[PDB]
Write a protein that binds this ligand. Sequence first.
Ligand code: 62Y
Ligand code: CA
Length: 517
Amino acid sequence: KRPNFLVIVADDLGFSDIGTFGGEIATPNLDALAIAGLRLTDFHTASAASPTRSMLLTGTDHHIAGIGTMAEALGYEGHLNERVVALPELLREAGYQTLMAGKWHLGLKPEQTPHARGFERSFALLPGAANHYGFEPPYDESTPRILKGTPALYVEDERYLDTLPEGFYSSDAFGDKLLQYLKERDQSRPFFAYLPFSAPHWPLQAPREIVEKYRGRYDAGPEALRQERLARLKELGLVEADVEAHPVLALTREWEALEDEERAKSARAMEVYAAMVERMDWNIGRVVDYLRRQGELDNTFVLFMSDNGAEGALLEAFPKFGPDLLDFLDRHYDNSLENIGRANSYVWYGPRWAQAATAPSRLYKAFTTQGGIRVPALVRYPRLSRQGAISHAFATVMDVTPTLLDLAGVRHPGKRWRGREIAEPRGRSWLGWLSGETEAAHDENTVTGWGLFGMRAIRQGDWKAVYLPAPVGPATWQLYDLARDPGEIHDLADSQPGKLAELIEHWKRYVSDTGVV
Ligand SMILES: O=P(O)(Oc1cccc(Br)c1)c1ccccc1
Ligand SMILES: [Ca+2]
C-alpha cells in the first residue's frame, strides 16, 4: 500500500483566515483535517503565485525553475522550463494517476500545459487570474493591461475550451472536475490529486447565498478585525503570548476617517472574501468526503497551503496595470454596494484588510518580509506520528516534492532525465521529522533565500536579513532575530554587524547558485 496524495493550494488566502488558524470564517472541512493533523506556523513559500508554484512542483528555487520573475513582468523563460523535472512527471512514470483541476499559472502554450507537464487528466485556468464566473470585458488595445493578462482561458487536457458551462463558478467547477476524475479513476492504483484554487484571489466574487451569511460581520473594520485575529492566534498557541505585532502601513485612509458609503462597500468586499473562503472550503469537503466514503482518506497524505501572503495590493496604484483601470471598470462593471460580489463587479479588498490576516507579520504579498512569505499549512496523514499538534519547525514549499517522492518509494532521477540535464531539489524530505525521529527537517545552519521584484531576504537558522527598496523600504539590509522578533520590528544591523555580513555572503551565494538577476 503506497499512499495517495492530495495537495490543495489556496490563492492569496491569509495566515489567520481559517477557523483553526485564528479566523472567524466558516471552514469546517479544513478545520477537521487541521485539528487531527499537524498545523505549521513557520512554513514558507515565495512572495508571489507563479514563483511559489514553480517551487512546489520541482523542489527547487523559482529562479532555477523558469519563473525568475512573473511572466507578466519580463531561467527567466516565464514558464516551467526544461532545466527541471516536475513531481507529477516523476509519479506518473512510477504508476500514479496524475489528476488536477485548478489554476495553473505556469504557462499558456500547449507544450507548457499540465497535460504536457505530467497530468493525465486536467481542467485548468492557465493565466494568473480570471473572472470567477467567466464574464469577460471587451478586449482590445485599449483594455487595461491587468485585464488583458487575465482572460478566462481554460484547458481540459489538450482541448482549449471555447465555452464554459452555465452556472460556472471557479471553485465549484474545480470541485466538480476533480471529483469526476476521482470517480473515474482506476481504483486499484494510487493517485496524485492537485487542487489549486483561484479563490480567494481578486476580483472578489462569490454566490450571494454565502455572502449573506457574513452580512454585517465586518462593520467594525480591519483594525478591529486584526485585534480579534491576534487575540485568537495567542489563545490557540499559534503565536507567542507576548509577540509584538508589526505596525500597519498603508497609504489609504483608516477606517474611522472613511465616509459611510465607502465603509459599506469596503465591508461588503470583506464579506464577499469570507464567502469565497467558505465556498472553497465547501468544495474541499465534497472531495474529502468522497475519498472518506471510498475508504481512501487514511492512506491519503493531504497537504493544504496558501501560495503567498494575503493580498494587500491597490491595483489602481500601478499605472503599468492600466492605463485608466478605474475608468474602464466604471464603464464596464457595476461596483455599486448591492452588486459587489457578482460576475459583473470587479473589486479587491486592499492593504488594511490584508494586514489583518498577516498579523503579527510585517506587510503582505509581493514582499520578502514574513507577511509575504509565511503562509498557513497543514498535513493530515495518520501514518505519521507527528499529528494532532501545532509545530513551529521551519519548513518551505521546496520540501514538498522530496517528501512526496520519499513517501511514494521514488528516487529523484538526479542530474539527467529524458536525455536532458536537470536541477536537483534544494529542499529536504519531511519524513524523518514527521515520522517523529527528528524535531525538524532543518537546523540552525540551514540557509534559504528569496528574491523578487527587487526585494531580498536571506535566512540562516532563525536569523533573517531583509532588503526592501524605495519607496517601500529604506533601500538597505535590515537584520532580524525571528526567535525574538517575529514582527521584523527591531533592526539589529548595527548591534550585530558580523551576523549581517555573514548573511550577506550567504545572499551572494544564493544569487550565484540560483541565477538571480
Ligand atoms: O499572481 P499574481 O496574483 O501576482 C501578483 C504579484 C505582484 C503584484 C500583484 Br497586484 C499580483 C498575478 C495575477 C494576474 C496577473 C499577474 C500577476
Ligand atoms: Ca497567489
